[model samples]
Target chain A: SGFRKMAFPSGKVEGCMVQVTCGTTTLNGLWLDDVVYCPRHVICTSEDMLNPNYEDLLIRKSNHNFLVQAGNVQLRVIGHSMQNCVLKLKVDTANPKTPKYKFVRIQPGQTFSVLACYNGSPSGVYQCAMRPNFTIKGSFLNGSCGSVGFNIDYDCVSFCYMHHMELPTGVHAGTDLEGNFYGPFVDRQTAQAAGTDTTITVNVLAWLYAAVINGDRWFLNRFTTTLNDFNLVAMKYNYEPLTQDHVDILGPLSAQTGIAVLDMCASLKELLQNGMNGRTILGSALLEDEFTPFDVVRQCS
Target chain B: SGFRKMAFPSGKVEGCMVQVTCGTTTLNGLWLDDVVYCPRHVICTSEDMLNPNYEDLLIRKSNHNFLVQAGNVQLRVIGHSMQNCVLKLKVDTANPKTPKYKFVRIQPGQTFSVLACYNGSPSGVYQCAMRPNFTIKGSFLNGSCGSVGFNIDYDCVSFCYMHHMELPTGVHAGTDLEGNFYGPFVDRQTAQAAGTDTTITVNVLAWLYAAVINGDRWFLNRFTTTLNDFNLVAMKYNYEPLTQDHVDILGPLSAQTGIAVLDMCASLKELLQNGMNGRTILGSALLEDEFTPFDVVRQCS
Candidate 1:
């Protein structure tokens, strides 16, 4: 067992898929018998055999979960190849020093509930386009051995990515099989029954602001853009929705066509852009004897 | 008492401190009877008597909490001024339609626990400078009546404001009575015992990353930055801390002086700036067979 080396039986390596770049060409390296082997490109010659930069693009590990993007990785293999993308490593959670195998890769668009006290994003209500590539990186056992890198081609999208943390409470985020992402809502059949097509955007915005005021997580990490704020307003504010007067003053939103799909994204975008500096047009127009700070605008104007 | 007004008895109006501007000058107006009266300025000339633009600088209202900054007005008098800067409004939470008198003013640097199901900042172990002025604006009892504004010269500082929501878990955020804001920690006494004075910052960063891997919230809304991350690495990773090798490759952090004060801020700033897109120098160096994405760097970098 003296530093024996052998070619990976197949084009894929199971345990480690670390990447090492040599000048212009990037090589897919695998961990074998304590050495990183890249058969197709030959072993890298640089003193820095394991390039940290290229390695990051391939995988990320943590105690709770792991992510592996299908960048150069051709197969979904972790701790030995499997059918599903997700893998469970040995978790000696009670002890910190136990040298255990801790590598797991998640499939894109699919999610595994994390076991932790704090939850956000992947744990939050929304899901983004993660097509068969989710890698979680963690502290490996060996002291100085480089990680084996893999190659998998996948796309990670942030179409509904939050530009700001403050969100209208109760909006849900989801992903489609075709790698498409939609959030805050998917369809609004019943919501359409409550207001005219023209007032849909106005009603939607009113619902978001009201939810944030009512301590919904949209303003924090807990925002779930799944529930309709329209329903919340009708039930919360005595069935009285924000009036046209509020809509008239929202500068840009006032010009929207109320097309649910376009307006949903537009509504959130405008809210973040304008609802800043402790002043919001919608809040100003409505807070009859009060002021609303829905935007959480920071710093001085 | 049929719609009658007086000189407010003194320079201060206990109930209402609404402000109105006449061209170049801003008038400190009071709410008496059903109308807003700016005594010294002989009332406002504009038909749009209540200006929403100037109103926002003074107050923000919500069902859970309210923020009132002392921008204008001479004294702190709310619902009959008293000793403390905080006031509690009647909460008829059992019913949504019941109209109630809801106005509360809080002194800056002070806080009141909100009655809410969700908890975030102000509850997440971090405090900022909100001196002399913390106003909670809510739906007024009346219809179309302008809110009374008060002036208290208070500075709303965001010195420790979070640029990104993700934090190094376990760091506590705090504010000083002197109006200074410090977070992730205020004083570090015992943490220095674990390493050389030079290794303080390195150990600290290592701890932060390790905690995140161990399901600490610093990466999500859960990051405290108060509890030293160094201790986390020692306990979680089997009583082991990251080596100098990790620090040597940090590029910028390699030159730090480790003065606690300087290093603390520097470490976080560098972490956010570089720890993006699933690539972090700290995560890269330590995860021998793993990869870490501490910064949550979004979009394609």
Candidate 2:
């Protein structure tokens, strides 16, 4: 939901970077792995202090004019909007035969519509008016515009599209499009037969995101045992799911205690930690089927 | 390494449970999750205590005879070894024909080798003499033996195989077989055109396992940027990697600080949390190559 606050700057430019000031230090605008790269700093104030050093960082959205607080910090983008824009170039008028071309530093905001990766243009300074309003362009990594030529080899990606592409067509999670979380295969027979079909590929993180971040209890409820497994483990380790209520009811200190709690979570976490072993998202019957019984007939269930 | 201490019963039986005495009460033998399920007890200990109640647990391996401390708690097993055994089934010799059959009370050590799931038998009792000398077999859920029939429908799985089977023919992690941790792909081209070939499927957990659990830093060292990403994020938020040494060198408190740490860990964590988001284990060039440039054609690189 925090992602909804993000908004990219208009025009064919990457205005995704931000300047962050932590304590007394101000950091330059740069995108490091989609998050605005912050300088690591320590707070000297303790919790007892009148105003503990909380929220010590100050963030500024730099690139002006079309600039806007693309609210979500996760929106650090890579590719720029592809659109046409003009640049002002100045030439030495006094020079006789071949006057040298010089770029005007002090000029209006410019749009970078293309990158070098697409153009295949050499990585060098070039003098040209790129049609409709050609101006000198060159290849460079810096996100700046001038008489400087377009970065023909410029290749970058956005955090949004990067994650958006992970889900298969049939499976969905988080704000992703609605689809079956159970995967494409209808049954065990089809699932086994569907060889090399990624449509049936089950992703663990998708389910985790849907349940943990999105808080879709109903979605996880479809697999009651799996959900229970997580809760049981959480309860065992006193994770988020556990509370005083459970302790009052099933705790050892209680009068009616010594009752063995069924294991579901730690086993599941171990199973997951071990890469799900042969255990299916299905449950115990299928797990036994996979390694022991199923090994006999070659059927999962 | 913890698994080495785990010792099962001498006879064919599961002796992996521990009656954990947490505080004042002891719990029964039951496997929940792989970790011994602790009743969600609220610990009242605070950091200011002279001697905070640490390690307030006393564990006893209940299953006697052939019982030895199995090092690892993760060894909660499903299947028992199938070996020659005997059962003393007492019947009413005084009853005539059509007389009802009942079981004897106190019995000796018994070995149960079969589960109901594999027997394909009805959930009922019957009198019989199984070969290798069978006494009587029945279907039940409780892991106890007596006049009670062996759990013919017992279907279960282990955490080991669940994760072991996840890796392809080549990739490995944790205590798994030593192999190419990078997967079976020869190059970027093969990795791109893998075509649902799981052998080339790169598992993130395997790499994480090798690095985290196994502490095989050299294995992850192959992916420099990916590793750097984790360290940078750790430094930014003060995770395990951000030590006083790093703070002294890269912190904002230093006179010549203000340097922006690159994005690595947080980005990777986010990307992984989003199911690897199209951002490959590879790096930036390929990422940019994926959406902006690669989208122009079908090639991923």
Candidate 3:
């Protein structure tokens, strides 16, 4: 069965189910199809298509690089691209009013790379598209390009690291890398006591510290919120994720120096959405049960 | 001759400037006469006191404590000591439909306080006043108490250490310490030529290094500009020397730091105003320069 799913840049989707029969003896197939309807339509006729607005076709990069106060930003293209070739670039702004976009043009069959130099803005959404100068020769070509979306927020990118320079090895004291006191009181007291047995306690503390410190709690929250918001926006615009390139750019962990908080949030959200009960999900043998391995202190059915 | 200068809280002077005639005019029993005309009704009032409005008063305190955005605040009368004092606080919302005031009674010779809170679209003004409840005898003795006005702007009282840490050190470098780098540079070269006898050079280099690190030449220009803007604001308001209590609460060096920057600016402005040949205000007296003493530099100055 050739079933398909179409997702929009704004995170909207539309689809229909179809049943296909091949021969006298029905080779039954459930054929599902989906497509992202464009928000603003541009019908290409022989005459008007050639005389497209040159000004609108050309992307006038904004000189006003914004050092925006932490918030969400939407980038939109006024018109459609002629050919379905992808274009990529980096946009950054230390000052909100003036954003500096460093252009990294990508040609067909080439890999797209974007390195973001982000400073504590809550979340950001960037759009990639084909050059507006190329078009299909005929309907057979079906040269319509797709857009991918990604979001990074404070919650989705917060992380810390533990250093052994200060703490005694094997001592599980709740001290940060610099030996500063932090976190819950009980854990701190336990760790402090463990500090007496320098090696082993410090080592255990180091691992636990790594678990929490390297965790980007804030960045993950922000990133998830941003992605959800982006999805909603894309859905509103009726945009679709058309190609694998689009998915590739928008998916995977961001190239930052920490656990992919965005991916983690997405995974968590999916696990929760599937209606997995707390006990079954939490009790999975595959899951590490180091900390308070689910002891049946009490039970509920 | 017995005319002592009487100072007022607002730095205003009133009363008469009488001259005494002795010897030939009157020996032992001196007669007082006026050389300069001093009006009996001379009133010393602050610009804020003249035709004071709630908005004006608010503006005066805007630099002290007020949130610009939230437009909602709770002003708690933390402490007070006075008799028959009537305290009134008002909040004017931008809507013009709802205007409100909160008042509290304060007894004489006792500690009294009140909390005034407001929430609405910010109107540019929030007024407050203290009027002593007049007794027939007290009214005759001290005259009627006047109302104190205040204005609230969209500006909040930001505790900006930018000016506090940036100004004095900044100006001290740009104007006084600009050309002082050459002496150490020369001493270093001389010491290198002297081979084993390089202690003097080492000392000189250490001294210069300390000065350069602490002086903040890297940020000198930016610091000077910011300080100038702050000074202009202070002068416009005719700000009095901050009280010891204010300094103690806000910071020990707050007033002196601000005053020193203002004094330096004034000195530079005066030099320029008096038509000095150029911007050079340096002297070579090492420890005993007229403009700045080495001891003062080592200490608070």
Candidate 4:
């Protein structure tokens, strides 16, 4: 159907949730057929909808197991969908016409494994594609995958959510989950010619380095589990969800432990801020790495 | 020595492949000297041998074409092995270490590439290891790393069995795996001078607000294989293998699938369950941006 009224409560939206947000408020955990206020807010895909089940479908389709079936010994990169997330697959077929859905759905960290099939018997000169998903604004599914199918190479397309915080640059940067930069750099010839790209290798090594140096703080146990790195009081004593509001720009509040919290907040408050985005830190210079705009894109759809 | 046991099958030991209980078992794809069985099932590392031609050996030790060479101003990590899976490299300076010829050889993935070299002279701070092989419990080989006058870093000490699974945490975790945390938090002097106490950066932004709202149960793939976040249903479906008697604690299920395909008279399922571990979900509030851990450990070793 079309759009519905925004009467749903603000919490986990029953069955499954999709986060809808604007510049300000965020409404999340919504199920399909859910409704929310439009023009009033900017909406984006929520992490809520990417169920373990839906992701499974995407992975299966990505691999040659399904989406790209061995059609009569020659496979086709077919498109499929699981809930709102739609995947459009394109290949250089004699019949280069594969259908694309009204919209595309790609979840950050979700990969659409594209195992293009080709053999000398007409399916030879094959190529594939790359997509940034979501608002493909001014986008079309027409591009060269360079050239492939000559041999078997385990090729893949992964999407990452570029965020304000990221791998200090090279460590776990570029590919995988930090940004979309890695896959876009390789088309066909480069894909099959080697293992991972050198920079990609460096990034992975950096990730390994980071993982080793301070691993406990890095990996997560489950989704949205709360743990902020800059709560000073909590660090020295206990975790009590400290925030900038604790300082109240207006002035010291009587509610906080007298003025101890206030005086501490007032003095060197600049010094106690969130500090550097962990993705950028010391000793990282050892890698001589730096960040770029692409590393911070809204890649995960 | 050519083939000591026709009594042995051409495969790995089986009962339930090491997945330590969680009501689920994972039969991984292993292919090395991948077999085992020590009398009353005591589990001993197999001496079974598996090898490719010398070309593979050189392929392993090379960087393009210089794999098996001591290059000019450059070097190649030469690869070699033994059914003993022990590696031996004696330099010109002397160190009678060559412990080959054994009845115990681990698989390829079990490599203990310990590249350690040192000297009182400047070049003495050198050591290189070549694993991609196994056998390191109480192993030794007092040898020099060929004669490296220069340095490059492909150095690795891969222990794939780093628990259920792990990614050498933070570019460095314990022995390339395991630990409660990593390089985050710096001293007041360190942060004010350089940036934040990092090990801090890695946790930031990756902490980039999925916590701001309800997030999805995904965000694992590629960086390091093994831990797939989407293995749930696959865990629930297929796999004609299920057990009842396997858990005598719950007693045999004669009321159900009533055909103890499980009745091989199992033993010792108690000490087999996967142990406790922690990671988080939707914004962790743990680190609190605390400082003071790593200016201690070597940065990105």
Candidate 5:
């Protein structure tokens, strides 16, 4: 038979190519078919696909009859030295409480790509959550532990670093690759006894302090300079293997400096220009002194 | 007189009573410092009364030290009827908008009863329009016409009559009772020419055919029994009252029949029953061949 000629119908059919990027360097196999893309964002199945211990197999089908099959999907983990690290994948689907699609362990330290095909519909809201379990424990600080959590929605990644202090309440340490630091303590047992003191700080680059204080021009300018220097150091050491001394030297210093810098930046122009620099600098110390006084004991006697 | 038991404030302050009615009613005059019982439905004005046309004179003069002046005052026409009339009188006050204190007119016909009083120190929205006009028109044939143009703010009368038309439009027979009809025709000569063809037809009692065709049941039943001996007469006579034949004989015949025993006992029901019988007789006459020709020409054309 001769070559057969195929004719295609003529009509305007608009389409878009959507992308899903990993919020962190490590990610496991991402199941794509179960993920739904709406006009506002993307959504995924909530079943546990990454963490095998709590893995739930119950699959939920949407009203549109579009679903992803887990057996035919894969996601790779990308970035430095994250080899064999577990990647916990979840599609938040705009709902934080329950998600749609999830995946179990995927090797880290490597770039992972997933193909998502869905019926393009306008449901108004779509989102995804990437839970990468990269837990780090500092040497000599038993209770001081940190983990990196990643949430992705509308092509934007929100990084959350969670640090739990256990033994010595005053101990401090740095977080994972995100550069979020925690504490330096007197002893491990004392740091562990810190009563699960957890602090969540996000590394949003230039947007961290601006996002915190909104449109405050003075705070934005001041905090931006400090953040830039800190971020430069982080960028320099991001690829290098971390050491206990590195965490000990920078952890508590960064935590205190970051908070203090934020406070100073908040009232920079007002306090400095009004000739009230002395009062502004020592206001908190004065408040602490007022609380330390024992007027009650004198009255009782 | 035994020293007249000295009293600190012994002078007798005599005030006059002023009665006023709305519509075109007249007001009688009375001088101040002389007590008098006002006429039942008349407005009494003091000799020191003043009229300020633009100002709300009644609302003023609540305070003392106003320029008290003597003048003749009258109850001016304010609304649609003889109730809730506003009178002009003077007292001691200074505001240009509110220059005097005129008495408020209240009567049974004027339903301006104080339903509720606001106890605010300076009461707001107090000067309200009261005793609005309400009227309706009714016709014997065409169903009653309800009130047409309402008060600037339309409201229901105390008890609405069932078969009454609107006050402003349906008041008169040829025109409205409010004297609105004759002017339009008189002003526009073209309107008279266009409306000239309109005429009222009068039907005969013995001519049952006329009653059925013209739909004049009122005249049909009345004349039939009172002039034709309650349908005992069978001969047809011309029903035109303006003709000499009809005037001389039909008038006397109707007068004589009015004295009969059956005529005295006839009710509306009896008249309606006779009318139905007359319709049947007339219907039979219309079915004849000679009448058929005339009916076809009149109805078909």
Candidate 6:
């Protein structure tokens, strides 16, 4: 019954991001795809490692994370009041202008996977946030935290919502120095830019309309099949009763797999290798519509 | 350029299924999952096999199908108007009370996988419809068929959807033929008998709602991580913009990757051999909350 059904951060503050780290290399969100897999160290739960309630628990174990050039941030949870602890990590501050706050909530025995965090703000810099140390805060901690106890080095590290807001160094009217001219006058440009960089630019809305307008029953009918694929994925993880935004990106019934963005480079590769017959082949690989390299780079870079 | 962007059928109908056949024991809804893949013939299109628009076509090749216990139907174009051809097969005939018609679309160079159909009134059969000669009716074509096509032993092969209906042989309406006495009369009894024969009972929706209503943020958040898993699967395939009805039944959104269902059996083996703590492991191995024995089978079987 203690099996935790998890998700990406609620993404309430999309411009705001979250990440994890150990020493410095940085990990999480670098690479994520179903085709990618971790064959071993599979598990029961984050808490499964510690208080494994299974009989032959040894049989099913995959305590593994992922790896990319960035680095693999190991997973762990620490605190005296184990149950109520939440660990927060700072990821992606590469753009000093816009910092990112990526957090992970782990209890006494919770360990996370590298693939797990991309679900947070897509805009969150999905890289290594080494310089930034982790801070902790929980229910029974202190002031901006619970009374229970913490800090980057504090045995107890808990920060309140108000304090948590100040953590992110990304997107805003810039530091107030106390730069007083922000927030109340802030346009949701920062919010709109959420995950703007990370996303693959396969605009479902544009294509949905394109297919429908052209009445390309061929591609039109295709969307339905794709939707089925999306729906199936949602059900598999029990990640259902989907969300609105991700679904809008690409999925069925609140489908949230995010768009299969158009990667012209992939299509160009096919063209150079194959030729015009490669167009249909490129159909799945390329994104020739309005959204393009310029737009994607604008958002990503 | 030699990439095959495969996907499930455009499940216009939920309970229906489509498949492909050849020397291989005709493949149909047999095995499907993102992790598993076909080896040989890969592709570049729905048109490549037909139009030789490419310069040197031999550069890419990947034509393959599947096999099942039921049957193996060949692929061919059976009409004078070669481009437009339809092949018919006798897959399932359970709903005799209601007649059935299932057709498969094929082209000269098209090699279908055993995963396409599955669209027709629910009353149609869903098995390997391998009998009943395919008769084509179109302009400039012969009476029962076009010029080029294929199948295995056209006659002496009539799998009855009608008789099969009598076979589920389970449900009845007291033989009134078109019985107007049904809808208004039966329901409560059969409703109680739901999953009577099979199911793994992962009352996930109930539990999904249960966890959310109970304000169990723990389980609720986990659902998000799970959603990421689902989203990943969707992106792997180019499928997008999902629908409602089909997903509700199991796909469109919650498409079961025969693998998930298969994993359950392996888990079940561990459990029957293991025990309750096994259930904790099973909590992950199996869909918890209400993911019981009866529920899974009903969706799968």
**lDDT tens readout by residue for model 5, A1-301:** 0000000100000011122222111111222232322211012222322232211121232222222222233222221111112222234332221223222222111111111122221001101111112222211122112222222222232333222232222222222222322233221222132223211112111122222222222222343234343433333323222233333433333353354443332333233234232221111111111100011111111
TM-score of every candidate's chain A: 0.18, 0.18, 0.15, 0.17, 0.19, 0.18
TM-score of 3: 0.14
TM-score of chain B of 1: 0.17
lDDT of each: 0.24, 0.20, 0.19, 0.19, 0.21, 0.21
Candidate 5's residue-wise lDDT over B131-242, tens digit each?
A: 1122111111221111111111111112111111122222211212122222122211121221111100011222223223323333223421343443332212211122
Tens-digit per-residue lDDT, B86-205, candidate 2: 111111121111112121211111212221111111111111111111111122222111111221111221211000111221221111011111222221111121122111001122
Candidate numbers, best TM-score first, in rank order: 4, 1, 6, 2, 5, 3
Model 4 error, position A5 (Å): 45
Using DockQ as the measure, name the better of candidate 4 and candidate 6.
4
- Fnat of candidates, each listed: 0.00, 0.00, 0.00, 0.00, 0.00, 0.00
Please list the residue runs of candidate 1 whose C-alpha ends up more than 4 Å from where it truly belongs after superposition. Answer: A1-260, A263-301, B1-81, B84-112, B116-213, B216-266, B272-275, B278-301
lDDT for model 2, please: 0.20
Better of 2 and 3 by TM-score: 2
Best-fitting candidate, measured by lDDT?
Answer: 1
Compute the interface RMSD for each candidate structure: 34.6, 30.2, 40.3, 29.4, 54.8, 23.7
Residue-wise C-alpha lDDT for candidate 3, range A157-259, written one tens digit per residue: 1111111111122111111212222222221112222211111111111122222332313212323433454334333333221233332342322322243
* Candidate 5 residue-wise lDDT at A78: 24
Question: What would the per-residue lDDT of candidate 4 be over residues A1-301, giving only the tens digit for each residue?
Answer: 0000001010111111122222332322111221111111112123422223445434543423322222233334333233222222333243322111111223222222111111111101111111222210010011101111011111111212111111211111122221133332311111221122211111212222222223222221122212243344344422233444432421222222232333332221232233223332222211211111121111100
DockQ, per model, reads 0.02, 0.01, 0.00, 0.02, 0.00, 0.01
Please give me the DockQ of candidate 6 compared with the native complex.
Answer: 0.01
Q: What would the DockQ be for model 5?
A: 0.00
Q: Considering the true interface contacts (CA pairs under 8 Å between chains A and B), give the fraction that model 4 also has.
A: 0.00
